[PDB]
């Protein structure tokens, strides 16, 4: 059988062997065209029926590009050559067309077996398209910087694909946005997108996010700003001022009708656009204080004994935890049932507390007398979460049914012709997806998880993933298709749990790593995965700052590092240190199939693996800066609910008049009054922070300094850099 998806897999970084690239063809430019056999073949031909003339093109074996082999496969970080994968399956045939007529035509392949058998596909249609200056659409946006004569809309036969259009850039602006981003604050000169994705460690270095948002503020040196939000969830690109140095050229896909693009825009103090931004999107929710404490996570805890022996550890080390996540707490099947529990099967219909009994000599004996237990103890549980159904055929008979069930009940996403989508990306591979584009979806999904908070009282949820719709005609229960639906899914998964947890009569603390326009006002976010290096460090501290920046209040991410062998001490001293001037600190370790050595970013570990035995002291100590500053970090999080400034906060919010704070993007304000500057290079000793306009105390020292200056400080590792404005006697 021949394969050809036009679009192909449609990894939003990557092209399969079985697609068209560009995957929307472009009259007068190349047109490379890809299909795969499932067998092994002779010989593969194309043959294009143009109105007048039919070629022929002989196609040629290929294999995958380097680069698009590697992001299949879940990119750099899932690969080295010390575990080598199999060889393709897929035999990838390839052609290309030089320079593509301007005239429709449709296309279809015919393969020789290797046993002789001649194999044809069936017929696709090709519509190349043209950039068209012609009124096709129209662009709905007011205020001054949109250049009115810069819309191209992308046409063929069929309809317009995308459009772009330009804004006026000046000078001396600075444009901080786009959701939250790794590689640098000031976007100025980048080419970027935004697409939901998920990419395995080093966000930085490859320039993409979990977490993006098609709105940016734009910042001049006198203190004005003005920003702009293309109001969609379809993909968008944006040329920052790269190509055309005063010029941010914006492309937009369109549907699949008259298009008409709503860009909003707003002007004023960069206080007053954010705002702007935050009355469209939504606005944080309020939290309980306890969000606010040591959040304590490893993904090795997976039984109650683990579980408590961390906890008893940080009680008998005077080192406060006020959250613990437990990640490996389920069945490994439906992530619905504790490891070991015993129930009678249900035809996947939602389960009670009183359904299950739990083996003593089981993973989790009492589950219930753990969370009752952690509570009086004023440490609240969170359980991990995926929006993935598993359907691998070794799967027991209750993960099964609830599979079934999911699919009975309609609330799966689907492919074009109505069957469920079944996950292409690499984790957790060919699973269902649940729709949860509508509150009937949404309420199925999480009913099945009610029992957790209304019996096991449970305090919320590690909504991890939610990036793993791929597909343009994917269809939702809401209506929209996957050009749509696909970047929102986060938003709605967020919604999902929070609603959950509203309805039981709790607080909405979900935590998750993924997110879009609109997830401002569900929840909590991490940073997602990164090794334990120095570069980490850096960009995590750009993603909080950016995050914050576009509304995302209640930002944290994994201290020093949750992948490979523990941070050297050095790095955990310094990360630790400035998590606690973040506005969630916590620690975490990913799995590694609980080898040896023990991998948790716990002070005792780290300590014991890197021989620094001080570690254990420093952690006590930044845990009591930590708790002191609670009071502190609710004030300020209540103001910023307010004000709609962030809590981790750019330095353009309160000093934009200062030109010089551009020079320094890794110092940022922690509510009003406390400037940060974290020491993110080893073997410092002392450490530079620019102080703006006005008087300043050190936090540790008391030692007064006058702004509009640069200071030096000693930096031991009971240090890190935090100035507090010097208030009125
Ligand atoms: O990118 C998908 C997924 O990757 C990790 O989990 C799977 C696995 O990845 C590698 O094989 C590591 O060596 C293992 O230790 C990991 O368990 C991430 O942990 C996960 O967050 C991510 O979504
Ligand atoms: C999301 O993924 C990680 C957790 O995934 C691992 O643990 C779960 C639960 O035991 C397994 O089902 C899964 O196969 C494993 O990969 C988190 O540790 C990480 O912080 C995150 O980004
Ligand atoms: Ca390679
Ligand atoms: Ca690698
Ligand atoms: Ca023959
Ligand atoms: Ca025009
Ligand atoms: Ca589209
Ligand atoms: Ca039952
Ligand atoms: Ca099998
Ligand atoms: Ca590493």
Known sequence: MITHRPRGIEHPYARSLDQLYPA?????????????????????????????????????????????????????????????????????????????????????????????????????????????????????????????????????????????????????????????????????????????????????????????????????????????????????????????????????????????????????????????????????????????????????????????????????????????????????????????????????????????????????????????????????????????????????????????????????????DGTPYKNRGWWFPNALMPDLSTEAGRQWWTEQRRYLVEDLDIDGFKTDGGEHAWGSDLRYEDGRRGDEGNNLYPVNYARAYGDLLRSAGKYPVTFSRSGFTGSQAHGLYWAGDEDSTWEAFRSSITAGITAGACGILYWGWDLAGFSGPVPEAELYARAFAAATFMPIMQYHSEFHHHELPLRDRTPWNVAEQTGCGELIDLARHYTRVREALRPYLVAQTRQCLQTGKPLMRAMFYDHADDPEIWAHPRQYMLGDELLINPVTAPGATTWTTYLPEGQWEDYWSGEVSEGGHLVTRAVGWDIIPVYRRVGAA
């Open 24 to 416: 929307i063809p472009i009259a007068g430019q190349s047109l490379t065209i890809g299909a795969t056999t499932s067998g092994p073949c002779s010989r593969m031909r194309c043959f294009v029926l143009w109105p007048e003339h039919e070629q022929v093109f002989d196609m040629s074996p290929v294999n995958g590009t380097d680069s698009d082999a590697a992001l299949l496969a879940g990119g750099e970080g899932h690969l080295a050559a010390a575990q080598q994968a199999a060889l393709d399956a897929d035999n990838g045939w390839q052609t290309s067309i030089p320079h593509l007529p301007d005239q429709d035509a449709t296309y279809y392949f015919e393969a020789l077996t290797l046993d002789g058998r001649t194999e044809t596909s069936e017929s696709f249609p090709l519509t190349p398209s043209h950039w068209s200056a012609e009124p096709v659409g129209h662009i709905d946006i007011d205020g001054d910087r949109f250049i009115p004569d810069s819309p191209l809309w992308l046409v063929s036969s069929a309809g317009t694909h995308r459009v772009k259009f330009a804004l006026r850039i000046e000078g001396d602006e600075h444009v901080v946005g786009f959701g939250e981003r790794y590689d640098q604050l000031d976007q100025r000169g980048l080419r970027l997108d935004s697409v939901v994705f998920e990419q395995y460690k080093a966000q930085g270095k490859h320039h993409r996010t979990y977490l993006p948002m098609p709105f940016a503020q734009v910042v001049n040196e006198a203190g004005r700003a003005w920003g702009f939000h293309v109001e969609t969830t379809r993909r968008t690109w944006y040329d920052v001022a790269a190509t055309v140095s005063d010029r941010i050229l914006i492309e937009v896909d369109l549907g699949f009708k008259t298009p008409v693009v709503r860009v909003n825009t707003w002007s004023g103090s960069p206080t007053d656009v954010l705002n702007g931004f935050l009355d469209v999107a939504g606005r944080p929710a309020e939290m309980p204080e306890w969000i606010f404490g040591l959040w304590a996570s490893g993904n090795e805890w997976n039984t109650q004994s683990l579980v408590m022996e961390q906890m008893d550890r940080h009680r008998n080390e005077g080192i406060p935890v006020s959250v613990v996540v437990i990640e490996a707490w389920s069945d490994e099947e439906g992530f619905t049932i504790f490891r070991d529990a015993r129930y009678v099967p249900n035809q996947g219909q939602p389960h009670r507390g009183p359904d299950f009994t739990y083996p003593s000599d089981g993973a989790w004996p009492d589950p219930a007398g753990m969370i009752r237990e952690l509570h009086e103890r004023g440490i609240r549980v969170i359980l991990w979460q995926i929006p993935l159904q598993k359907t691998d055929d070794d799967l027991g008979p209750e993960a099964l049914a609830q599979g079934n069930a999911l699919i009975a009940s309609g609330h799966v996403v689907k492919e074009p």
